[model samples]
Target chain A: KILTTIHQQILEAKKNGQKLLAILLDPDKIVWENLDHLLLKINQSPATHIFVGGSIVESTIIEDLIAQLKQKTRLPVVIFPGDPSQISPKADAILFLSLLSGRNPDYLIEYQVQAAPILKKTNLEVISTGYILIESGNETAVARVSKTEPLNRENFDLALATAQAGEMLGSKLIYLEAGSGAKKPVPLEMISVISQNVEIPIIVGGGIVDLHGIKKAYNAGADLVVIGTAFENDSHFFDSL
Target chain B: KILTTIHQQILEAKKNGQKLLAILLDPDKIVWENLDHLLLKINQSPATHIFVGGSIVESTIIEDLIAQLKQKTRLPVVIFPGDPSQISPKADAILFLSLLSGRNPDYLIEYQVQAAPILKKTNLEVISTGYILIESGNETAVARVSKTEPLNRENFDLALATAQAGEMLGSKLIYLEAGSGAKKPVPLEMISVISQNVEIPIIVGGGIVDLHGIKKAYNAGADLVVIGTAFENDSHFFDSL
Candidate 1:
């Protein structure tokens, strides 16, 4: 794996290359009035981090959810945002993501440019991350939200190339995404190739229905596995692991 | 076609076998707080009837929506219920339906048994209807909610058999259903067979994405064509028909 010549502390951000597990909550899907059970289950789950954001979430809902997350759990809340309006100062960190797989200009730089200033004013840790969306059985939300064709699922050469180029472009992390609740999960071999070639911590998400898939991705050399739709669909998704 | 000897006013209720255009609104999917534009469009639309009820709708929402519909429009509101709990005295009529498709006792008799006593106390017009759910491209909500297999969509012999049997069992209106928002619409040939063999007014619904499907169903001798998910999805669905 080719490592970028960055600070050692940044490389240690994931804590000596251990497996990082995260649960994502779409604020629109969250029923704020009766989240007591959801909060308790989330705390009981074996998750290292919490991701808060959605495709078109309002700041009002985002801020409130993050505040609730902070009060209820000790896990760090990271903003895996779609819109610039999703940035919440209550969160500990933000994934400054570039749609590396997509040719869309807005998701590539325009959105990040507008997002940079607001995040700069905060004490939030800015983690420069590369977002790579991959094709699945269905046309996922990320593809539609970004308005771009996801990268070839079978084309490991291009997948590796994107991750390598993204690392070269100063991304500390690479997210191999299939979007939330993909009809199919990201191909395990692609994770094998990307982890073999890319130096950064890779967060693979989408279509993982259970813990076995998480283990398959982890065993296949995926640095981190994001459990979103699966965990949201079943609060016990992290159980019996 | 065999016509059962029934009250002339009941047959005249549909206005001498003219086409009946109905729109179904799932009370749960309706946003009541800001329904001004929705109400205006429903008025402008060429819907002959409005069907209210959902798989598991609450009495509070059903009653309020029916009241709103009555105040705003002249169309008769019919209760196409999933449970007896959806019975609303405010609605003009109710399709006292039997799941002629499923062999399940609860949907077949138990629900209707509990439902009949409550309606017996009301001034509402009780329309005896036969609901025959047909299998489609996907397993629809009706199939899941009823916990029974939908009838074979291709089995014209059985489809005709069910509709004819339903008419024999005192059903005035026979609904050849594919469930709301089915991936595939009811077969045109099935409608042809049922319309040819059955004596009652037939309501064909599901998977009519546009007016063309409506025209097709109408041409197939459908008595009442229900525009639910399609019209609900696009309020202007009745336009240019």
Candidate 2:
């Protein structure tokens, strides 16, 4: 019974007063040449763990990236998958996400079911997360790709209740995501309300453009803060644009 | 002061007939290009009114298209805007939507505030709509762009409560959207429950792939059945797909 779930590790760290910061690493974005350097920086930073995957991953280089991350840092390598295809054998765990924000059965049940067989064979721990997308002023690639509309901010209580439903449905973690490369960050009020209402630790991420925004999310009761764009490993974004 | 909002229209329609169908036309898509042909089709078909706009509108093109729509179609040219910029003076009315599914303040307040000035200027009627996206099984562009997660389909009661809250907040309509190109349409049971509980018109749209799905939506007690991807100029596919 070698369970690889990050649950105990996360719990222990919380007791030790260590704040968690999960860094999202899209495998397609990392160049072999610079990966070592980027991993080193993530290892040194306050970031508690590294998450690998993106919505439409074009490469299987994630397996190697996870192995490298495990070798270089004591931090856990969690896979925040974009889709089921993003799962890897070498990863420590998978944030089994149910896009609670989407009506598409693919995100909620179909894709998760599709990934079930693969997950059963993997050594990776599975963490079911209630994925709640918060609105950022600008459209992120995820929103464009998801083709679904988000819940409104004024309806924080509604989101809180939706997150409550996910918790009732056995989700261990609730992630309030504003989305990657967002025009604006998630509102602190939203994080505060949902975190207070839900049972599990709230992981807030997406559109964290500044340290101030990060601080706001933390203050709003986010147990773990996830960062995506601040890293230099992003491949699709060119400097000129 | 001949102010007539779509809110009144919806109520009137409900009083007149037990069935209705609303069509969503995103100004950025193919429907935006040949609105003339589309309107003609709507006239011949079972459509009630046209809902125009998307998450991020170009504004200029939308304004012109709406102006053209005003001149041609005798059917109500309503603005189902993705953002405030989707507003047009030419529209007969607008579904002033608030995404009741996610907790993003911009979609709740900021975008609404931005739309206010423009809405006030237009002679068009403005109707507040509680737009809830139920999980449809895919990552949709609307879910991504709005930067909010939709309510899970399993949590239909919560969704109904959210709609009720919208009514409490003065919204005139409750739109239960399943997102475009959904693998499955909104659960009929869910729609029936919400329609039964809510005071206003319940609009069900997204993933409506056939005439049966359309009929089912009405049978479920939806005052308006909205079809997007299904009727997006794919006249030949409806018979087969």
Candidate 3:
């Protein structure tokens, strides 16, 4: 079987001006009783990738969830971990993240060090991503969990600088996060500036609740827009849209 | 009784050229079977303060541990919390920490923001501290938990800069930490430089195994030295010294 890495697929998508979407699932936050139904709903959604992870979640739950996703859906499974402990070999790929916006060493390098040996033992493709947290008006679990501040919403220059630094550091993708459940998503201008300057896929998420929100993010230059809380809160989110 | 705040007491000790020692305790790691003897043993030690808290610890356990220590000893009980969740009103003071060595926003401000209202309702003195984690020989839980990198052991310049930033940020004290159960302690030269340059009291700890280690830390300009693993490992640790 011919195989394409997630990074290559994203690169291809970015080059073709194809807007992608990811359905994010935090295993711990699942309405578990309705999980099977949710999986069916995800299969019907426009999400191109199935991203897994959340703060302080267990690997066992993630593995079980990934196993289920792989069996039921044709979508690529990507592990978007909060830390090293949130990884699984069952996933097709993992967002090997470096919190470029936060100077926390663990997110910058140490946790990656811890995960280095583990990945060598895995079959998952490592997608080096520069994860930049943008101020979303409300405090996010990502900010609290990483203990790093989000970039100022108005300071698009610093955001651009951070994204450039990530691309320079060999990141394949730039994730401009507004923190999950942010009151305001990452600014469209920041996304535009970073995409214009950096040569990598830009993944945008936070407060993008509808098709209009998704379109605006894509218009702003986001290669992939992630839908987690919105899809999670309403299973028929895509159905209405 | 007129009570002085923990910050004032530390300032007085720093000004008087007197060294302070604290016996650190991880509530979850307590030898519950030997609780009475351990409590008495601490009372027999030269520990001027008692520090409570550790990673993944419950506030209920910390409260129980602090409540017992108050009845058994006269030493001040301080909360060296790993997170905002690891707090109790029973403690004398809290190291209102902002991790200056790394730029994780939560430890730098978010968790402090989370802790602010809680402190306002408490009887505890809020000791604003600039907590700088130095590189130990091996990976430390503090580095892992905070998801921040420790300062390079030999990079005293950066350490000094971080300490200076903390002091400027209104941190009354600078904690030069090497992390709990570290393979190596914070460097003497680093302590000396920060002490000479910064006007605040310097607190040092981690991997200080003996009286000589404690003395060397003080000689290096540490105003307060914390003993956690060594005292916790050997009940008669002070007797030999």
Candidate 4:
């Protein structure tokens, strides 16, 4: 039961000074022909968790993808759902996210209330997460789809404030996103500021295109880093590593 | 100048016991061939406001549509944007909506924050609206896009409570939506309950297919009613009167 919660695993890793990795899968964009090949790479990769979601995805495909992941991969299938409609009983757990960086009430509370009753019926371990989005140079799908502005890339103070707020608000994890395919990743200084202050695990992702970037973020204090488009664009993104 | 603010107009209408009507136009689905015919119908209708927006719309047409509406009609053009990207200086006013009904933060505050700087650069009057979505018979676009759940149709108390909370949160108007092309409109009883409980003006829209449906909502205490698909489906929807 203790192993069932992703948060505990993250905390244990943090206590041991170990880093974690997650690979994000957008169900809509997956090329079925290369799925087995993709899974093979994932199996060989350093990813401790398999994070599945997209800015907009069909519920049917989400379920189908999770089922396949469960069958082929030993990595815990964690849902990073774009919305409540993406909830799946097949997934091991869900990152119940709140877009803390945006002032949108729907992301803060409305969707949570809607998801609560539905989540009650699911056996998935629910991990409340504070999802803070930082501005990337280019407009990302999350920013466009959610219709929320991201924190300024240069404003490390504001990012720290938002992370602190999330920690105080009872969030079990803090995910600093620069939006998928970000032109720039969340600033290293900002990550350090947050990690130094908050007790919860911090997950950073978006715009980390190279292996060096991942190492840089880990050194800067990110407990976990997610890779999506980088890997999607190249099947062997981690081949050199 | 008095006509510059749509919220002010709504307030004045409430003070004088006058009902208001808005004709919602989705730019994405507009039939350019029937533009002249549609404009003529809207000008001839009892609509006090010309509401422009859609669940998913291109920013380009939104500006064009508003320009066309401004040129053809004397009625105020209010932007009922699906997201912050829909903001335009050309519109007389915008409904700064917070999806009070959904838990999605993007709709509640994130979009608003993103829109603020842009809105400040424009002269568009910002009217804060508390948008409440009631569960329609089927999955509506608002439900899907926002990724939030609507209030249960039969749960009038929850709706009332939600409306009261919105009013307390400093919303200028409370909008009860059943979602576009809903199998059923928002229950009139729910409108009555909200109107009776909250002093702020109430707006009712979605799934209102006929004139009687508008009257029913008005009588039930909807200070304003919006008609969309009905008018889009039959430009002569108001011809019978």
Candidate 5:
């Protein structure tokens, strides 16, 4: 019910011209010593949601991290799993992701099937998300790990077509990712074009190093903006906002 | 010229009732100090091809290794690239792979597009391959990195369909991968059904720990058998033969 409510909240905020923010957490990268302080910063920040995932996380700390996130923060803890094994029943919801940017059948259908049986047993709400990866300046983990190509940075038409394809494929949300620690974020123009065309809520993330980038994405019509490396690097990243 | 000859050699070998063996070399795992001994073993072995690649190899040793392989042995040095970044002009050929087993668009076409320009600049023969992954009992690197689900081991029909689809999609070779260091090799039945149904050469690899496994896969219609972990673990693995 809470997960259902979260989706509705996103839609409602989008309709009402209010923006949302999520903090991306790589479970493998979390420092146990700094967790309490990190959670405190998340609680004090403007992040409306918490997203958990990474390129190749082989850690068992996910469930505990989600549980702690639930206890320490008011924001919804959404599982943005890198793979099916990243699932946890403790999360409020899971972003059922299809790598729309890559042509790998595994990202589109394989992981989904693997995750379905596990998700059926959980109370987590499954939000079908079309994940489009835009080309960053350099080779990133998502590109290498997925063995997929990112849309050319300047190819706005291709980016729009990918987003539209995701919408047509029954994706509830379209996530425009430049990849974790991207040398450059998704182009503002590309985001604007995709947002103007798609009816679903848009979630933009990766390479967003500053508050200004987040605001830029929002101003260009990203319903929700996610911050990872920026916040990970500085606990007080949101304090400046 | 050398690149163009690799695929032709396999086709010619298949027609002449000769099965092929490839010694898969993951540059990350290679013991550089034992290079001479390894080269000597490869020359002594019945391996007809050398597949150089890994799940996440980032070292520059690939080019150097290929150069050494070319100088030390008569077998063709082909690149089984993990991503587009693994391209090298030194290799005789490269498997231009599409993870048809997974629906990640990046692996399907995006990486190809990114690699196209780079490939055009090289003399490496580009062999289009349809990479279908079968469940290997544990979470293998290919499964994790591609974020795709492997076709169930028991689901021979699906595997057959996937291989058939690959042939129809213009794949010159259909690789039935069990993932690197798989707990088990691709099922003999699956290999048989796929080989019987498709016209392309079938490559079986992963989890094959012995010479008997290679013979079994060959008997099941695998045109080429790739040996990685076994060879990496024991340089004299081929010496026993």
Candidate 6:
């Protein structure tokens, strides 16, 4: 059993002066054929956590992928689900995300209702997350696959207020997503605004390309920084940057 | 007199679907030297706003910078004062910032009082701004120079509430600053939260490195995104992505 929660892991990272870095692996990207090379990076790099799942994935191989990654690394495996079908029982935890940025009922409540039964079978910790997607140009898969529009980038004050509402609604983590393969990364200033304004640890992710991006998230008060596409682009890129 | 007030310009941008890109050019970045190239980029780019000032800039040359920039481009030249002395008559507007992130009376009231007379003398549009700095990694010059503790990044609810309080107190715009050259960019999730909660436009800036970051800010609900280092690094670099 995973004795502690994701929040506990973050606190430990804080005390150690080691920044928290999580890698989000699209379930579709991992296969028995290529997962070995991918999981090896987690086994070798400074990545503290692994988030698996995507918005549009079919469940055909989700179980296999989770089983394989679980056997491969000691790092906590958290599910970053895009829809109801992305859920699996063999994981450590699930960031049961509510797409707070969109108004669609499907993303906000519909998927969760469908996922509830399957999630009960897993020892997975269900961490309620307020997932807010920002427009990242190139129309990211999360924004695309979720079939919901992202919040505009020109309104930080509104974002502050929205995150506050999420906290009020009992979201444990407020994730600021820029979407995978984003043409840009999240703005440090925007992160700075919300982190300064809110109480929850800010988890920044989507299209980070280097150390500077990671460091920028930290500087702006992000407790955890996430990386995705880059892992698929080149595993060595993570360690070198 | 300046034809368009800062508030009016923001409204115009929103109506036109033109994202407002602001530049914070330190007086140090300009002088008699290299002003031409700086002016060239400002002219060539789609940037509609310019801000002049820094952490501890002297008042002497700011007026000259504003005058030069005003002569070079038709865009609004705003002053982001480090202190009361940074105000200039030549600029079109000044973000009369109140450091709501802290309890420091100097940042909250002292500077405003000191600059009030100078502000009145100028025809500068007075745009009351709530300036909140999120904790970017490393000891930022703004954090260090201000001699004030930054608002907690983890406690975003409190930060949002505080920002709302500032708005209630009559701030027109909330500026989420990550400080110059911060280690990480602001998270998009927080930005989304702020955007959804606040009615006013949010101005996000500092440590922005790429177009992806800019686009994410828009997606996160930022009304305007500010970029300095990316453009300063190479005006071409700002647009390269």
- Shares of reference contacts reproduced by the candidates, in order, are 0.00, 0.00, 0.00, 0.18, 0.17, 0.00
Query: All models: lDDT?
Result: 0.77, 0.73, 0.82, 0.85, 0.83, 0.75
Model 4: CA > 4 A from native = A1-241, B1-4
**Best model number under lDDT:** 4
Model 2 over residues B1-241: C-alpha lDDT tens digits?
Answer: 1344566767887777657676777666755556677667766666667777754768788877777766776668888878776777878887777676767655654465456545545687767677888988987777899878978889875776677555543457888888878887889999998888766888888898888888888888889988777777574333332
Which residues of candidate 3, in runs, are more than 4 Å off?
Answer: A1-241
Tell me which of candidates 4 and 5 scores higher on DockQ: 4
Best candidate, DockQ? 4
Top TM-score hit: 4
Mind giving the per-residue lDDT tens digits that candidate 6 earns over B104-222?
55665446645654564668787878787887777677778778676666667656765554443346788888888878766677677776777777888878988889898987888
DockQ (Cα-based) for each candidate: 0.00, 0.02, 0.01, 0.08, 0.07, 0.01
Q: Interface RMSD for each candidate model?
A: 30.1, 14.0, 13.6, 9.0, 9.9, 17.7
lDDT of 3 by residue, B9-64 (tens): 88888888989999899998897889889999888888888988756786888888
* Model 2 CA deviation exceeding 4 Å by range: A1-241, B1-5, B31-35, B236-241
Q: Write the per-residue lDDT of candidate 5 for residues A6-111, one digit (tens) a residue.
A: 7788999999899999999998889989999999999989889999987566546898888899998888989998888898889898888878788766776566
Tell me how candidate 5 scores on lDDT. 0.83
TM-score of each: 0.48, 0.49, 0.52, 0.54, 0.53, 0.49
What DockQ does predicted model 3 obtain?
Answer: 0.01
Worst 10 residues of 3 chain B by lDDT: B162-171
- Per-residue lDDT tens digits for candidate 4, residues A123-224, read 988787879999989888887887889999888767776765455334689999998989999999999988997789999999999999999999999999
lDDT comparison, 1 vs 3, better candidate: 3
CAPRI tier of model 2: incorrect
TM-score of chain A of 3: 0.97
> Over the stretch A183-209, how does candidate 3's per-residue lDDT look in tens digits?
998888888988888788999988888
Off by over 4 Å in 6: A1-241, B1-3, B15-17, B239-241
